Each structure stands twice: as C-alpha cells, then as structure tokens.
C-alpha cells in the first residue's frame, strides 16, 4: 500500500515544484550555520521552487550529487547531540529524539523550526535524509496517541521501572507521588503530573493512572514547545493533511528512504539461541526474508530493532540499550503465539513452527501489528 500512497502524495498540487529557483550557498566547514541563514531568510514559497545548492569554492555542475551531500552533512550537524536539539534514542546510538533540555541554548525554538524545514525540504524535493527517529516522534508527527510501549525507545530504564510497578505490589516498597523528576545537567527539578501531584501518594490502587500520566508527560508534554516548533517548520513545506496519509512506519521510509540490505552481512552477524543456523525453522526464516522485498525487510528491521536504519559498517555494529547487540533469534514461546521482539536487544523470540506457511504468516502478522 506504501507505493500507492507515495504516488498519490506526489500527485498533489501542494507538492508541485514552483517556477523559478531557490538558491542556497554554504561553506562546507560551516554548513549548519550557513544553511540556517540561507534557509530561514526565505519564505516557504521560495523553498518550493527548484532547489539549487552550491558549496563555496567547490564546482557544482553535478547538481544531484551536491544536493545529496548537502542533506547528508547537514543532517549530521542538526542532529549532532552536542547541540542538544536532538539526542540518542534509548536503545541505540544512531537513532534520535528531541532533547528536552535543548533550552540551554536560548535560541533553540528557531533551530527546531529550521530542522523541521530541512526535513520538509528533503521530502518536498525527493532528497532522503539521514534522519531516523524513535517511534513516538513519528506518531506525534502524525497526531496519533503514544502508549507506554513507546517509552522503550525514549527511556528504556524508565520503561522497565513502570512495567515492574504495573506487575508488582509497590505498597511499602516505593515511596512515590504523582510527580516526576526532570533531570537537567546534574540538577533535578520536580514537576507535578496532575494538580497538587507531589502531595498525592501513589499506591497499588492508583498506579495505572500514575504510569499513564508519567508516559504522557515524558514523551509528549516535556518536549511540546520543541515539537511544535519542529512541526511548524515541517508543515510549512508538507501540509499536515497530506503527510497523515502515511502511518508511522511509512513516514520513516518516506523521510529516510529504503535501504538495499546486504542479506549475507546480516546472516553472518546473527546470533542464535536455542537454535542452530542449520535448523529447519532458521532456514525457513531466511527463506522468508530473502523472498521478501526491500520494504518488507525494512519492516522486519523496524519490528526487531526499532528502526530500518542500518549502521555504516553493517550488521556487525548493530546497537542495543546496553551497547553492541547483534541481531538475535531465540527459540522461545509456543506455536500458538506470534513471534515477539525485544528492541533493546535486537532479539526476536521465534517459536518452533512446524511448517513454512504458518511461520511466514505468523511473522507477517507480528511485523505488521501496530
């Protein structure tokens, strides 16, 4: 369905290249600062014209190549955690989320607007970016609700704590109120989760509510101004009513493209637990993956690891919440159940299905489930 949506999307009036040209000049060594000046001094109408990019002191007749290097270099500066606009996800070091303490730079809201424009510009002009976000951020872009499960990519340790609370008696174990700790550079500041929150004790009786309130605060409330600024920049190029034709997984592929995956690199850097490479089910798994197309494999990757994003040096450098974590397949669960993923460990729990067709279908349902 993604293909049809893309065509439809690209067929809209709002997406037509406007007559004339948009001229952008930057110094390579100053691409962030120069691009910020070049792009913010223009109107959205201006940037919907044909994009023309030149690096100072460098010949630019290869327009496509210059363009591609522009979006590549720029996205690595925008999203460089040093600047605290974005920061790493909780389950790797190459996928990103909004840094809640971005305000340490007083001017951040404008730079979030600028990033939203850069990302909107990439989409508008068919230039993929190295911009891979945590799941919750795509959802917020699409105005969809976020749930506790979305916390895993945002703050995995906090994710585990809330689950432990939901599954275990906390009475007499945890002294807890309807407040949260907002860390900032060594300081701790307290926010109420609900009115008079710090003065309201959390119990086994009301902890579900506490968890849902915490989930909403951490993922959605604490980055609101930043997110609004970002969408403002983004929706100036891509109207919201069009981009919501996509779901959150399609939005990722739309922005960052679809990688051509080296299947052998992948197979070579896979761990097996409870299975061996020679096992029938493992062979069915790779049969299924091989016969799939690039979008279908990217979707398996989103399911297993949180992202379709492949590290520069291949599957050997796959990351998890606690450091390097290889793609891993484990014999676990019963033949009744669907395969189950653990994105903190890049691990798929695959029960030992006894025929190929039920496996392909179990795995397809598991990957497609939102």
């Amino acid at each position: 369905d993604f293909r049809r949506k893309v065509i439809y999307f690209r067929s809209q009036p709002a997406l037509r290249i406007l007559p004339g040209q948009c001229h952008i000049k930057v110094r390579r060594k100053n691409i962030f600062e120069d691009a910020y000046q070049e792009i913010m001094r223009q109107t959205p109408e201006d940037l919907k014209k044909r994009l023309m990019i030149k690096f100072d002191g460098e010949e630019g007749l290869d327009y496509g190549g210059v363009s591609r290097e522009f979006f590549f270099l720029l996205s690595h500066e925008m999203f460089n955690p040093f600047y605290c606009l974005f920061e790493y996800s909780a389950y790797d070091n190459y996928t990103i989320q909004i840094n809640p303490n971005s305000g340490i730079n007083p001017e951040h809201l404008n730079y979030f607007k600028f990033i939203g424009r850069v990302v909107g510009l990439g989409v508008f002009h068919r230039r993929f970016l190295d911009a891979f976000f945590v799941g919750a951020l795509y959802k917020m872009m699409l105005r969809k609700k976020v749930v506790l499960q979305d916390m895993e990519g945002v703050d995995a340790e906090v994710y585990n704590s809330l689950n432990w609370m939901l599954e275990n008696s906390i009475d007499g174990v945890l002294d807890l109120t309807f407040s949260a700790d907002d860390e900032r550079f060594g300081e701790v500041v307290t926010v109420d989760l609900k009115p008079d929150g710090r003065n309201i004790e959390v119990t086994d009786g009301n902890k579900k509510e506490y968890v849902e309130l915490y989930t909403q605060w951490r993922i959605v409330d604490r980055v609101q101004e930043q997110f609004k600024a970002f969408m403002d920049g983004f929706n100036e190029l891509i109207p919201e009513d069009l981009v919501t034709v996509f779901d959150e997984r399609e939005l990722e592929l739309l922005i960052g493209g679809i990688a051509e995956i080296d299947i052998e690199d992948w197979k070579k850097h896979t761990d097996y637990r409870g299975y061996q490479e020679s096992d029938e089910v493992i062979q069915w798994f790779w049969k299924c993956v091989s016969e799939w197309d690039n979008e279908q494999r990217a979707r398996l990757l989103q399911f297993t690891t949180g992202t379709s994003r492949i590290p520069v040096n291949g599957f050997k450098d796959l990351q998890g919440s606690d450091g390097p974590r290889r793609f891993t397949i484990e014999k676990a669960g019963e033949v009744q159940q669907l395969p189950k993923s653990h994105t903190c460990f890049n691990r798929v729990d695959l029960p030992q299905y006894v025929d190929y067709d039920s496996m392909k279908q179990k795995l397809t349902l598991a990957v497609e489930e939102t």
């Binding site: 000046q37 606009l85 920061e87």
Partner: protein, 81 residues
C-alpha cells in the same frame, strides 16, 4: 602554590573527558583544556555544574567544584557565535 584535582567533563554523546585541574583555575582555563584535547573552540562551549551555567572569569572553587566532580559540556547553536 600549585595543587591538583581530577574532574570529569561529560558530553551529551555520552563521552567522558578526564581533566587534571587546580581548584583556582578559571572556567575559561577549563574550556581551553577542552580545546587542547578535543579541538573544540572555547567560544562554542557552555559548561554546567549541578544545573548552573559557569561564567568564564570565575574559578572552579567559586562553584564548589571538587575532586572527581562532573561538569556537562554543551555546544552553542552555530550562528549564535
């Protein structure tokens, strides 16, 4: 009239930088040790200890920074100087 101290400078990329300093070193001195080791120009740097942004002409002991304290390094937005 010269005494030493280990401090740590933590980046948002999770990297930790070990610095040997004196309590009476300026914040400016520390940014310039950071430039030595990391090549980052002092004017791009903000240092923060336990929440407060550190001013260039003050000393580590002015902010009660002690042995094995951690400071947080954050870079200014390009174009804001």
């Amino acid at each position: 009239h010269h005494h030493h101290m280990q401090i740590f400078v933590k980046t948002p990329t999770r990297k930790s930088i070990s610095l040997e300093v004196e309590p009476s070193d300026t914040i400016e001195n520390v940014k310039a040790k950071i430039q030595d080791k990391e090549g980052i120009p002092p004017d791009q740097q903000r240092l923060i200890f336990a929440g407060k942004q550190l001013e260039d002409g003050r000393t580590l002991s002015d902010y009660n920074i002690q042995k094995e304290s951690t400071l947080h390094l954050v870079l200014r937005l390009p174009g804001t100087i």
